[PDB]
Curated annotation (Swiss-Prot):
Disulfide feature: none
Matching InterPro entries: KH_dom, KH_dom-like_a/b, KH_dom_type_2, KH_sf_prok-type, Ribosomal_S3_C_sf, Ribosomal_uS3_bac-typ, Ribosomal_uS3_C, Ribosomal_uS3_CS
Descriptive protein name: Small ribosomal subunit protein uS3
Naturally occurring in which organism (per UniProt): Escherichia coli (strain K12)
Gene3D superfamilies (UniProt xref): 3.30.300.20, Ribosomal protein S3, C-terminal domain
Biological role stated in the UniProt entry: Binds the lower part of the 30S subunit head. Binds mRNA in the 70S ribosome, positioning it for translation. Plays a role in mRNA unwinding by the ribosome, possibly by forming part of a processivity clamp.
Gene Ontology molecular function: mRNA binding; rRNA binding; structural constituent of ribosome
Stored SMART domains: KH
PANTHER family for the chain: 30S/40S RIBOSOMAL PROTEIN S3, SMALL RIBOSOMAL SUBUNIT PROTEIN US3C
GO biological process, one term: ribosomal small subunit assembly
Gene: rpsC
Stored NCBIfam families: rpsC_bact
Amino acid sequence: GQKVHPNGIRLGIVKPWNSTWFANTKEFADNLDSDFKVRQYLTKELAKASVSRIVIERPAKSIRVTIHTARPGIVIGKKGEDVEKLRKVVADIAGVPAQINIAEVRKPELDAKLVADSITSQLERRVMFRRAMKRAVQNAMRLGAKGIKVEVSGRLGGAEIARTEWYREGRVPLHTLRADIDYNTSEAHTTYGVIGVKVWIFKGEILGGMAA
RNA sequence: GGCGUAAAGCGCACGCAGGCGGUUUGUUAAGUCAGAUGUGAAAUCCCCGGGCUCAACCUGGGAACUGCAUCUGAUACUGGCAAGCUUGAGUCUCGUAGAGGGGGGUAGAAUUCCAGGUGUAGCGGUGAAAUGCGUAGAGAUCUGGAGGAAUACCGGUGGCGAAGGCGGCCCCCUGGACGAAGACUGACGCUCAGGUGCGAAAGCGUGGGGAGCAAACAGGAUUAGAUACCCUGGUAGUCCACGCCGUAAACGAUGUCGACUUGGAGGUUGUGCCCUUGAGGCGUGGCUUCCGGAGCUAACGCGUUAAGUCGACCGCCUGGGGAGUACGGCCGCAAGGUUAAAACUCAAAUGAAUUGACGGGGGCCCGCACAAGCGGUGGAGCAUGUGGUUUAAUUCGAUGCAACGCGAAGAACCUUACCUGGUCUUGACAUCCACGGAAGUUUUCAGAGAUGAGAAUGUGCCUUCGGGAACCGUGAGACAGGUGCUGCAUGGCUGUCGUCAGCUCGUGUUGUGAAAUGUUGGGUUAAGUCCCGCAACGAGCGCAACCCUUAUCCUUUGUUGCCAGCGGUCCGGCCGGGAACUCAAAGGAGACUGCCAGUGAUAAACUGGAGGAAGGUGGGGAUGACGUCAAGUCAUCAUGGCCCUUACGACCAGGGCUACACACGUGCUACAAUGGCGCAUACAAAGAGAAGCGACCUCGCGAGAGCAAGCGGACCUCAUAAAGUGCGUCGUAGUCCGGAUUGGAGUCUGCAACUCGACUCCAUGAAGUCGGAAUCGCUAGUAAUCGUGGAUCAGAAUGCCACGGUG
RNA sequence: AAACGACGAAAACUACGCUUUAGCAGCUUAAUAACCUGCUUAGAGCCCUCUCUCCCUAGCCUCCGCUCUUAGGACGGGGAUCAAGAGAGGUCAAACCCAAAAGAGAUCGCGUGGAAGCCCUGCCUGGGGUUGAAGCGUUAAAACUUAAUCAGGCUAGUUUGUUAGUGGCGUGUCCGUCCGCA
Ligand SMILES: [Mg+2]
Ligand SMILES: [Mg+2]
Ligand SMILES: [Mg+2]
Ligand SMILES: [Mg+2]
Ligand SMILES: [Mg+2]
Ligand SMILES: [Mg+2]
Ligand SMILES: [Mg+2]
Ligand SMILES: [Mg+2]
Ligand SMILES: [Mg+2]
Ligand SMILES: [Mg+2]
Ligand SMILES: [Mg+2]
Ligand SMILES: [Mg+2]
Ligand SMILES: [Mg+2]
Ligand SMILES: [Mg+2]
Ligand SMILES: [Mg+2]
Ligand SMILES: [Mg+2]
Ligand SMILES: [Mg+2]
Ligand SMILES: [Mg+2]
Ligand SMILES: [Mg+2]
Ligand SMILES: [Mg+2]
Ligand SMILES: [Mg+2]
Ligand SMILES: [Mg+2]
Ligand SMILES: [Mg+2]
């Protein structure tokens, strides 16, 4: 192991949590079990939709999952029927009634999860990894990101020996703890194994710490 | 085309034939140049046309047949002839330097022997030793004598010589080179296949010489072996004269001569003139060294002494091995030399340079890596894991540093895969289904249970009622399943170098090009941290900072946390009350080389100090680059093929992971008078608690048992911390030391501790009595020594992870 | 052993889409350009949707649950549809935001005085205690009140001990003179 996960090293400084609630470990295990279940159900359901992230709040005898996505229209549906359809299942899985929020994410090519997504789809549909990564990094640089670093490893191009390629633009200060280093992972299930993809997006230096 | 380095300059010099040849005139016109004639067969090629329906094919003419012979001219060049000239070349006259060669003499240093004197137990030698020399007087010292070789300093990138080569001094003969001025000789000039001559050392023959050195050889020594490197002796040889071979990295790996083509710093040796006041200056020659411009080269490098552009000549090269080998001719007393192949094999063999890596290469620097400690490990039981052993299994993985108190943060069945026994074939675990009943709640037997039967039963909520949740049973089919394998297909995660300080990119520049600068060099540092200088200018990953804890102060708000001041007391924070404090957890100030001197390059930076709780990162943690190790996990999980579907899949009972001769690793108890023992007695922090922590009373010698209040926790518990401190007691002891083994009977948790936890009593009292080679961590609240909490956990730490006491 | 790597010259997820300008930025000797561009300002022609502009109604609730209930509200239902238009969006359900009260005391819940069991006590007569067991009423009332009865046929006379006529397997199989439990 070389690099630690850049999210949980600055979660207490500049980055927000993906789950906001409290427990006295009387129900902590079941709360995360419920959070894991709802997260995996949402990920399995909203496959076509480009879901950016899933934040969960758990107030007293209620929950609130605020999904952030790039294209919210598919999840919304006509007259807001699909959200009502997929809200009851979440509510009954979590026990307490739910209230699902949906947030559109501006600049869909500047989110770590979004940029890590659909590159696996390109690999599945047999798009060359080098050109795919180059297009992703150049689009992210053009949109406004100050630094982008993309790594792709494992059975690239259906070869015989796996390797690890990477591209980098601008600056990616992974060691500093006063910058947005939003990072997410994704995997592709090709015809000759599994390919791992990692993306680091440095946007700026957040002075002052948490709460802006 | 090339010959400095890949293959290619004879080792050098002379020189015959031959090749070439300064300058002017006249003559000849042989080559050469112009024109004409004959011939150069036909055929063929080419060009223009035609015929075969096109083409192939045939055909007419033209051109061509690049050649030869003859005739008529041209005269610049080459050639022949005759006259001239000095600029090429050679000679005279005078000086200059020189280890140039041959021959003969002379003088010391030094080594070795002979003889003598003084003198006693060592000398010599090696990383260390011995062979060797010594009491028969060694080594050392002094005297005289014998003999051989070379001539310390001068002595240099100095001189001479064609090359080889040449070093005291003197004499005799002689070759060669340069310069000042002077006249003639008049092309007499350069090279050279054959040929001749010289030719390092080693080698051979004859006749001598032989001090030192030294092949062969003898002995000692290291090493597994050492026919060597090392040591002690030692023959040929090295020396002289005449003879023989003609080999070298005979090297400047560069064949001889001519002229042309920028410069600087010298060395040696002449010569002209200037006031020669110093090895003062201005010119001109000969030899030679270093740097370097243009130019050349694949590059290194050459660079007026070209490896720059030419001219004349000779020799050599045509892939690496076979091989400069055999045969053959010649030379030679011989060794051998010279001229010099062929068959067969190979896809390369090569040289200059570039980036890494290595060196028993050099320079500089850092880290408990050594040095100065301290304590332990290895010695003897005790708790663990690994290897092998045995078994049916001792389930599998990790197998150097980076595996061995590892996954496992804790195996009686559970976990659990392995084995012995029994059962199932859509399954324990999903989706699609046709039905019959909601389920479900007690229960009887067989059985170790898995599951085989049997019952009293429930008759749950839902529309038009062939119903739906939902539950089970039967029949399959896809399917489910694998801790089966492939981490040499992988994703993800992790260890190591290493918290070392380096790793790269953009532009520019340099070299054709791999590539280099930037990144090196000088200070400086914890550091690619900074500065300076420099074809470098900037940036990214990086070394730091931002992040967490703690070290001081201020403020905000005082309960469950505190008592500066007062009142009472049940003397206790008890509570009224007091919000300064100890403290609680939020925001700030605060240490930033900031300043003062010295040092340094007028910097960077370093040393000391007035201040501060703090000083150069104040003290710790997190943060672990490019990348290396087919590094470890397909048994956390996912994933591509491969494997089984009556079995590698599914369920249950009992055993095994904890095991008979051992070794290894990491820890604990210790060894004793620094100590254990009996009775009083203070000083902490951090954490846990809801079928859990568990106050008090009573039985208990005891683990604990009935009773249990309080506590989702600054309230109540876990939980009078130990070391120490007070007093006795033990006197260096098979010990009042170590509690390992073993027997008896129990206490708590767990359907159930025989295989296999721990605590408690009684007794028994193994070793040991400071540990061999070789080793491990630590530089300050650190190493040692003492106790406690917490993780998974029904119970199980001597392990792991953190607080503290002393230090 | 082994290990190379050439074409979004398949702009390929489709944001309604397509426009001009306004300025930053890459492009550069230098100011335009092609755009490489993410926005910001403007108009919507338009493919689209929603409140709609139709009428009737006063549809308007909200504190106390409900009952004509008051200040006030941004407050409010049915029906087929459009010519043009006033605003929001682009496959927008909530959230962020903006708000709730004067009522009056009509009622199920909610609280009732002579009643079904449980206390020596197991069957039970047990009122002695009590409710939604019987009269009764609003955010409140006509209030009001779940254990302590002794003792009885009460395991029923042969069950406990004086005690035997046989309606008895007795004793590996036992026919079994006799022993042995009632
Ligand atoms: Mg050639
Ligand atoms: Mg050569
Ligand atoms: Mg060579
Ligand atoms: Mg030569
Ligand atoms: Mg020769
Ligand atoms: Mg002629
Ligand atoms: Mg002619
Ligand atoms: Mg024709
Ligand atoms: Mg002809
Ligand atoms: Mg002539
Ligand atoms: Mg002479
Ligand atoms: Mg010759
Ligand atoms: Mg000789
Ligand atoms: Mg000798
Ligand atoms: Mg010798
Ligand atoms: Mg001789
Ligand atoms: Mg030779
Ligand atoms: Mg040579
Ligand atoms: Mg010559
Ligand atoms: Mg010379
Ligand atoms: Mg040079
Ligand atoms: Mg030969
Ligand atoms: Mg060595």
